[PDB]
Design a protein around this ligand. Structure first.
Ligand SMILES: *[C@@H]1O[C@H](CO)[C@@H](O[C@@H]2O[C@H](CO)[C@@H](O[C@@H]3O[C@H](CO[C@H]4O[C@H](CO[C@H]5O[C@H](CO)[C@@H](O)[C@H](O)[C@@H]5O)[C@@H](O)[C@H](O[C@H]5O[C@H](CO)[C@@H](O)[C@H](O)[C@@H]5O[C@H]5O[C@H](CO)[C@@H](O)[C@H](O)[C@@H]5O)[C@@H]4O)[C@@H](O)[C@H](O[C@H]4O[C@H](CO)[C@@H](O)[C@H](O)[C@@H]4O[C@@H]4O[C@H](CO)[C@@H](O)[C@H](O)[C@H]4NC(C)=O)[C@@H]3O)[C@H](O)[C@H]2NC(C)=O)[C@H](O)[C@H]1NC(C)=O
Ligand SMILES: *[C@@H]1O[C@H](CO)[C@@H](O[C@@H]2O[C@H](CO)[C@@H](O)[C@H](O)[C@H]2NC(C)=O)[C@H](O)[C@H]1NC(C)=O
Ligand SMILES: [Zn+2]
Lengths: 49, 47
C-alpha cells in the first residue's frame, strides 16, 4: 500500500502538490508567510502582530 | 526629561498646528507630533 506517498488525483479543479504524508509533516511546523505577492499591502491592512 | 509618550512641555515658538497631512499624504515629510520627531510617509489606514 503506497497511498500516502502518492499525490491524490483530482477529477476537477486544481491539481494538488502535496502527498498525505507531506501534508501531515507540513501541518506540524509553524512557518510565517513571507508575503511574496502582496506582503507590503497585507502588513498595512492587518496591523501590528 | 524626554518621554516616549507625548511631551507636554513645549516653548511658545514651537506651538503650531500645521496639520496639513491630508494634502501631504503622498510625500516624504518631517513630522513633529507631540514631541515625537522623524521622517516618513503617511498612508491612509483603518484601525
Ligand atoms: C508550469 O509550471 C508553472 C509553475 O510551476 C505552473 O503554473 C502554476 O500553476 C499552478 C496550478 O494551476 C498555480 O497555482 C495556483 O496559484 C493560484 C494563485 O496563487 C497566488 O495567489 C494566491 C492568492 O490568491 C490571490 O491571487 C490569485 C492570483 O495570483 C487570485 O486568483 C486569487 O483570487 C487571489 O486574489 C497566493 O496564496 C499564492 O501564494 C501562496 O501559495 C504559493 C503556493 O501555491 C506559495 O508559494 C506562496 O508562498 C503562498 O503561500 C502561502 O499561502 C498558501 C495558501 O494559503 C499556504 O498554503 C502557504 O503556507 C503560505 O501561507 C500565490 O501568490 C492559487 O490561487 C491556486 O490555488 C488553488 O490550488 C491550490 C493547489 O491545489 C490549493 O491549495 C488552493 O486552495 C487553490 O485550490 C482551489 O483552486 C481552484 C481553482 O483555482 C479554486 O476554485 C478553489 O477555490 C481553490 N480552493 C481553495 C480552498 O482555495 C494555485 O495555488 C500557480 O500559480 C502557477 N504558477 C505560475 C503561473 O507562475 C504551470 O501550470 C506549469 N505548466 C504545465 C503545463 O505543467
Ligand atoms: C492504504 O492506506 C490508506 C491510508 O494511507 C488507506 O486509506 C484509509 O482507509 C481508511 C479505511 O477505509 C479510511 O478511514 C481513511 O480515511 C483512509 N485514508 C486515506 C484515504 O488517506 C487505505 O484503505 C489502504 N488500502 C488498503 C487496501 O488497505
Ligand atoms: Zn501609500
Amino acid at each position: 500500500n503506497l497511498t500516502m506517498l502518492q499525490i491524490p488525483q483530482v477529477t476537477t479543479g486544481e491539481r494538488k502538490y502535496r502527498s498525505a504524508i507531506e501534508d501531515l509533516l507540513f501541518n506540524k511546523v509553524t512557518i510565517a508567510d513571507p508575503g511574496y505577492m502582496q506582503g507590503y499591502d497585507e502588513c498595512m491592512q492587518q496591523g501590528p502582530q | 526629561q524626554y518621554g516616549t509618550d507625548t511631551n507636554s512641555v513645549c516653548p511658545m515658538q514651537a506651538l503650531r498646528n500645521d496639520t496639513s497631512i491630508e494634502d501631504k499624504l503622498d510625500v516624504c515629510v518631517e513630522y513633529s507630533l507631540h514631541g515625537i520627531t522623524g521622517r516618513g510617509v503617511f498612508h491612509n489606514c483603518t484601525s
